[PDB]
Design a protein around this motif. Structure first.
Motif, PDB file in Angstrom:
ATOM      1  N   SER A   1       0.846  -1.186   0.000  1.00 13.24           N
ATOM      2  CA  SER A   1       0.000   0.000   0.000  1.00 13.24           C
ATOM      3  C   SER A   1       0.884   1.239   0.000  1.00 13.24           C
ATOM      4  CB  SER A   1      -0.943   0.036   1.209  1.00 13.24           C
ATOM      5  OG  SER A   1      -2.017   0.931   0.980  1.00 13.24           O
TER       6      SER A   1
ATOM      7  N   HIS B   1       3.360   3.809  -0.341  1.00 16.09           N
ATOM      8  CA  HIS B   1       4.792   3.812  -0.656  1.00 16.09           C
ATOM      9  C   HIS B   1       5.109   4.904  -1.686  1.00 16.09           C
ATOM     10  CE1 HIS B   1       8.871   2.786  -1.413  1.00 16.09           C
ATOM     11  NE2 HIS B   1       8.806   1.475  -1.272  1.00 16.09           N
ATOM     12  N   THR B   2       4.968   6.150  -1.230  1.00 17.65           N
ATOM     13  CA  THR B   2       5.364   7.305  -2.027  1.00 17.65           C
ATOM     14  C   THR B   2       6.866   7.285  -2.289  1.00 17.65           C
ATOM     15  OG1 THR B   2       3.537   8.664  -1.211  1.00 17.65           O
ATOM     16  CG2 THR B   2       5.440   9.808  -2.135  1.00 17.65           C
ATOM     17  N   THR B   3       7.238   7.061  -3.546  1.00 19.91           N
ATOM     18  CA  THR B   3       8.634   6.938  -3.942  1.00 19.91           C
ATOM     19  C   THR B   3       9.292   8.315  -3.929  1.00 19.91           C
ATOM     20  OG1 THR B   3       8.284   4.922  -5.231  1.00 19.91           O
ATOM     21  CG2 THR B   3      10.117   6.303  -5.916  1.00 19.91           C
TER      22      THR B   3
ATOM     23  N   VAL C   1       8.499   9.874 -13.698  1.00 20.95           N
ATOM     24  CA  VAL C   1       7.741   8.638 -13.878  1.00 20.95           C
ATOM     25  C   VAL C   1       8.312   7.779 -14.992  1.00 20.95           C
ATOM     26  CG1 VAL C   1       6.029   9.390 -15.583  1.00 20.95           C
ATOM     27  CG2 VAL C   1       5.326   7.887 -13.680  1.00 20.95           C
TER      28      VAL C   1
ATOM     29  N   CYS D   1      11.164   4.651 -13.715  1.00 21.75           N
ATOM     30  CA  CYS D   1      10.773   3.652 -12.732  1.00 21.75           C
ATOM     31  C   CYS D   1       9.669   2.790 -13.323  1.00 21.75           C
ATOM     32  CB  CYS D   1      10.297   4.315 -11.437  1.00 21.75           C
ATOM     33  SG  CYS D   1      10.555   3.322  -9.958  1.00 21.75           S
ATOM     34  N   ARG D   2       9.867   1.475 -13.297  1.00 21.68           N
ATOM     35  CA  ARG D   2       8.880   0.536 -13.807  1.00 21.68           C
ATOM     36  C   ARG D   2       7.984   0.040 -12.681  1.00 21.68           C
ATOM     37  NH1 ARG D   2       9.671   2.226 -18.169  1.00 21.68           N
ATOM     38  NH2 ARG D   2      11.350   1.605 -19.594  1.00 21.68           N
ATOM     39  N   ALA D   3       6.813  -0.463 -13.064  1.00 21.19           N
ATOM     40  CA  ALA D   3       5.837  -0.951 -12.106  1.00 21.19           C
ATOM     41  C   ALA D   3       5.247  -2.260 -12.605  1.00 21.19           C
ATOM     42  CB  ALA D   3       4.721   0.067 -11.877  1.00 21.19           C
ATOM     43  N   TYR D   4       4.812  -3.092 -11.662  1.00 25.38           N
ATOM     44  CA  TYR D   4       4.204  -4.373 -11.995  1.00 25.38           C
ATOM     45  C   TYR D   4       2.952  -4.589 -11.159  1.00 25.38           C
ATOM     46  CZ  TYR D   4       8.592  -5.200 -14.382  1.00 25.38           C
ATOM     47  OH  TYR D   4       9.678  -5.100 -15.217  1.00 25.38           O
ATOM     48  N   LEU D   5       2.414  -5.807 -11.175  1.00 25.60           N
ATOM     49  CA  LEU D   5       1.169  -6.104 -10.480  1.00 25.60           C
ATOM     50  C   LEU D   5       1.091  -7.606 -10.263  1.00 25.60           C
ATOM     51  CD1 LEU D   5      -1.914  -5.855  -9.659  1.00 25.60           C
ATOM     52  CD2 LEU D   5      -2.398  -5.661 -12.073  1.00 25.60           C
TER      53      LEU D   5
END
Lengths: 53, 49
Positions: free
Chosen positions: A1, A3-5, A10, A13-17
């Motif tokens: 939940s 987690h302000t980087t 943008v 930085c990569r993101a997943y799920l």
């Protein structure tokens, strides 16, 4: 939940799920999972059958 | 700087249980027949010999 980087852009930085509630057929056009992915089976509905033409 | 695995593997199709070419080896075997027999004043009687 949350987690302000603490970084700026943008595009650097990569993101997943990780959804594991449901499961998918192992296509050849999907990336393989992490470790031991189980062999759980679904039936094929319309099998061949020898009929009269 | 990346790596894709992409393995492949050949297995039997699901229609192989309904049509396939069986490959037999033939040796000499038995001979059978069927006869129709009448004699004198009786009717035809048939049997497998």
């Amino acid at each position: 939940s949350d987690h302000t980087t603490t970084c700026t852009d943008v595009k650097q930085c990569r993101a997943y799920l990780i959804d594991n509630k449901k499961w998918v057929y192992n296509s050849g056009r999907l990336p393989r999972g992490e470790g031991d992915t189980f062999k759980g089976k679904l039936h094929v509905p319309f099998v061949p059958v020898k009929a009269k033409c | 700087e990346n790596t894709q695995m992409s393995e492949a593997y050949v297995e039997r199709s699901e229609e192989c249980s309904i049509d396939h070419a069986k490959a037999y080896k033939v040796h000499t075997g038995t001979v059978q027949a069927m006869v129709n027999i009448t004699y004198g004043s009786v009717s035809w009687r048939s049997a497998d010999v």
